[PDB]
Amino acid sequence: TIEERVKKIIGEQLGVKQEEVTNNASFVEDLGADSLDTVELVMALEEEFDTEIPDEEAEKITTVQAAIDYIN
Amino acid sequence: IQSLTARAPVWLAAQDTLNQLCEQSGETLASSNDVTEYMQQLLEREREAT
Amino acid sequence: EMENVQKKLRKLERDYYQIREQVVSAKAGWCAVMRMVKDNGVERRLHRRE
Ligand SMILES: *P(=O)(O)OCC(C)(C)[C@@H](O)C(=O)NCCC(=O)NCCS
């Protein structure tokens, strides 16, 4: 479904398969994505949905679940 | 920022080199003195081996 | 006056999303070479930060 986008791109972006991304984990350290990687990730999500997410809102997406929470 | 940027390449090359040279040794160096003491150890090992 | 700034922002946007496209595609592609890097032949032999 639509979330498959997110769960895809994240796994696509951070080099982790779909199943690796538990909702409870945190991108910053659990997924090993650094500031550069996290910015790339959020930007990829935003372009994918062609939506807009101001960086301040982006700052809250540190956890896996938040990714879809804001989306949906 | 510009000063540090200009300085950087030298320092990073210096690191790379020390990193290699040190892992070559069974030790982690931390100080110029530390290096001199390592020199003393090397000299003793040499004057033994000979 | 404001209408011209509106058009300027349109120009900025048309640049911006396209830069996003580039970056996301590049990272997608480059993930595989980092996977290879995790073949652990990687070191300053390959990763040459300076
Ligand atoms: P970190 O060592 O991963 O470095 C991050 C970074 C400073 C290079 C940069 O990519 C970043 O993550 N910046 C945070 C967002 C930001 O600064 N926005 C500026 C908007 S004009």
**CATH code for position A51:** 1.10.1200.10
Q: Do C21 and A43 touch (CB under 8 A)?
A: no
**C45 contacts chain B (CB < 8 A):** no
* Residue from the list C20, C31, C35 with its beta carbon closest to the beta carbon of A47: C20
Residue of chain C whose alpha carbon sits nearest to that of B8: C50
Our answer to whether residue A34 is catalytic in this structure is yes
Sign of CA dihedral C28, C32, C38, C43: negative
Residues in C touching B6 (Cβ below 8 Å): none
Q: Is C7 left (phi over 0), alpha (psi -120 to 50) or beta?
A: alpha
Q: Which residues form the domain of A40?
A: 1-72
Could you tell me which of A7, A36, A33, A34 has the C-alpha nearest to residue A22?
A7
Residues 6+ positions from A28 with CB-CB distance below 8 Å: A38, A62
A34 in contact with ligand 1, CB cutoff 6 A: yes
Burial (CB < 10 A; 0-12, 13-18, 19+), residue C5, is exposed
Number of independent structural domains in chain A: 1
- Resolution of this model in Å is 6.8
Within 13 A of A39's CA, how many CA atoms are on the CB side?
6
Cα–Cα distance measured from residue C22 to residue C30, given in angstroms and rounded to the nearest whole number: 12
Could you tell me which of A71, A47, A36, A54 has the C-alpha nearest to residue C17?
A47
Could you tell me which of B43, C48, C18, B49 has the C-alpha nearest to residue A43?
C18
Structure-solving method: cryo-EM
| B19 neighbors C44 (Cβ within 8 angstroms) | yes
SS3 C45: coil
If you ran DSSP here, which 8-state letter would residue C39 be given?
Answer: T
Residue of chain C whose alpha carbon sits nearest to that of A46: C20
